[PDB]
């Protein structure tokens, strides 16, 4: 599981929901539901449409620049699995979400 | 294609070859009509047998005439070597008889088909069908002797070895009873009888071995006697043409 974010919904996409589209340029366009997937085909603008999060982050609504939003790095070193680090992080993400 | 044509299907002696096709017609085609039916179906009934019988002789013969590798313009090594086994005279004439035999059947078929559309009764058309198959049967009964010939070439030809003319071959000659047999089993994984009397081997034997990562093939011979080259034996004759045709040490 990877649980994704919708390319247009900007919402999380659980597996078994939604459709990936693959361009000839071959990068992945997943969708939360067919509402936004049809909105991709009709080629609207989520920076212009209100009810997605890409608007609300860009419009000066719901805050964006914050240190609690800096921890969602997609990492590229898989390092080593100490089991004790896991015990920290499960308490950490519980702590983090309250602060946000 | 080339090299030891194992896959020439089969053939039967003539009475069975007759019996195969006729029983194939009695089973595959329908078999029940009445006098009281419409005339058009009656002709359509007997036409359908005479046609369907006619292909069965042809398609078997076409399996034969496609089958045998057609001795001339094969390769001059193989072309000569089969005549030493099979009489290139007796060979060709047999198969040429079959194409003569095939073409008569299509000729007989097309006539009795063409005659049949003017039939007026059940009784007349029925007598044409029996006459049609009988003249087919007279052809196949005539064909008895060359068919029994082509049995025995077919069982023999698949059991021939395949040599290649162009590859790196080498010849093993010497007198009979010399020591050439046990030598060959020593140089290669090959199944040669080693008995110390003269004309033990009567046909060529092929073994394979490798040297410097290269496929070599050894060829045994039966053996030659002094025998001043006019009168010789076909068992000896195989020995000669291997030396004659092949590029070899």
């Amino acid at each position: 599981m990877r649980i994704y974010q919708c390319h247009f919904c900007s919402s999380p996409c659980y597996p078994g929901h939604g459709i990936m589209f693959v361009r000839n340029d071959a990068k992945e366009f997943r969708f939360c539901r067919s509402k936004c997937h049809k909105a991709f085909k009709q080629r609207r603008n989520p920076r212009k449409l209100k009810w997605t999060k890409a608007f609300r982050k860009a419009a000066g609504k719901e805050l964006a620049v914050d240190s609690t939003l800096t921890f969602a790095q997609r990492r590229n070193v898989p390092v080593r699995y100490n089991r004790e680090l896991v015990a920290t992080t499960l308490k950490a993400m519980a702590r983090i979400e309250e602060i946000r | 294609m080339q090299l030891s044509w194992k896959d020439i299907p089969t053939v039967a002696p003539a009475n069975d070859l007759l019996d195969i096709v006729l029983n194939r017609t009695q089973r595959k085609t329908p078999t029940v009509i009445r006098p009281g039916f419409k005339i058009t179906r009656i002709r359509a009934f007997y036409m359908r047998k005479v046609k369907y019988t006619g292909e069965g002789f042809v398609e078997k013969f076409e399996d034969i005439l496609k089958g045998f590798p057609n001795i001339n313009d094969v390769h001059p090594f193989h072309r000569d070597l089969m005549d030493t086994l099979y009489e290139k005279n007796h060979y060709k004439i047999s198969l040429a008889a079959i194409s003569r035999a095939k073409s008569l059947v299509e000729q007989v078929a097309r006539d009795y088909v063409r005659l049949l559309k003017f039939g007026q009764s059940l009784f007349q058309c029925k007598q044409l069908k029996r006459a049609a198959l009988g003249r087919m049967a007279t052809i196949v009964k005539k064909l008895r002797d060359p068919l029994a010939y082509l049995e025995q070439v077919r069982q023999h030809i698949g059991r021939l070895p395949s040599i290649d003319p162009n590859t790196r071959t080498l010849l093993i000659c010497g007198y009979p009873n010399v020591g050439k047999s046990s030598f060959l089993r020593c140089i290669t994984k090959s199944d040669v009888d080693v008995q110390p009397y003269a004309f033990t081997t009567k046909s060529l034997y092929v073994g394979h071995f490798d040297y410097k990562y290269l496929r070599f093939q050894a060829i045994d011979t039966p053996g030659i006697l002094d025998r001043p080259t006019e009168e010789m034996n076909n068992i000896e004759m195989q020995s000669i043409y291997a030396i004659a045709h092949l590029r070899s040490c």
């Binding site: 070193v77 898989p78 | 990562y213």
Partner: protein
């Protein structure tokens, strides 16, 4: 040390396998005859790891690396990727890398020292590889075949290309990689060599239908048996002339 193996009937060994000086990777399908083949050769001396990439068996072409590091495409799941870092010892750097282009084993061919790339790879990857693998990077085609990994095999001893490679290609390209180069074939003459076989500094594994002439050629350039320093191409003159 040329060794014939099949994957379940397949001679395309380099598709289903990745091999360096220090580790080996196999797919997980079917049965462990294939894994046992590397067990027989390598002993326990290097880690040999069952894995998948994107849940797919084709791991010799999705991945690329050397004894220093190893690269994986974007589609690597976290389960797969954690499984590698658990598996390999800490001399090995592992990194998911993002592009348009996906199959690293076709885009990149490499050794411990100099890597060849597809010419249209993006620049930040070209930045990244020299940091990861610590090697030399060159944008270069093999004879116009734009894929360098399928159409070439590499080592530190030597390298092997597809048989449509001009001498004019080989002469330039060898100066880039500083190893001798051979126009060759594999697996009854399949022109794709990188899918055909794997090789390192001390083992070469190919398909069953790689011929015994072809085995000797592979044994020559990659110098498996001690020692075949290409001078025994001076012995195989009588073979290859008669072969071709």
């Amino acid at each position: 040390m040329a060794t014939r193996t099949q994957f379940e009937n397949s001679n395309e060994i380099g598709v289903f396998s990745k091999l360096t000086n220090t580790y080996c990777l196999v797919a997980v399908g079917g049965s462990e005859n294939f894994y046992s083949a590397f067990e027989a050769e390598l002993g326990d001396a290097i880690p040999i790891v069952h894995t998948t990439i994107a849940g797919t068996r084709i791991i010799g072409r999705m991945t690329a690396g050397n004894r220093r590091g190893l690269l994986v495409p974007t589609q690597t799941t976290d389960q797969e990727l954690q499984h590698l870092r658990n598996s390999l010892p800490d001399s090995v750097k592992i990194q998911r890398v993002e592009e348009r282009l996906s199959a690293l084993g076709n885009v990149i061919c490499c050794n411990d020292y100099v890597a060849l790339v597809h010419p249209d790879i993006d620049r930040e990857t070209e930045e990244l590889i020299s940091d990861v693998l610590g090697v030399e990077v060159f944008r270069q085609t093999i004879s116009g075949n734009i894929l360098v990994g399928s159409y070439c095999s590499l080592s530190n001893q030597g390298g092997l290309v597809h048989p449509q490679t001009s001498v004019q290609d080989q002469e330039e390209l060898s100066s880039l990689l500083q190893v001798p180069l051979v126009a060759g074939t594999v697996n009854r003459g399949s022109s794709v060599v990188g899918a055909g076989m794997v090789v390192n500094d001390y083992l070469a594994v190919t398909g069953l239908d790689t011929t015994a002439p072809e085995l000797s050629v592979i044994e020559s350039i990659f110098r498996l048996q001690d020692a075949q320093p290409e001078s025994i191409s001076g012995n195989l003159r009588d073979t290859l002339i008669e072969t071709y």
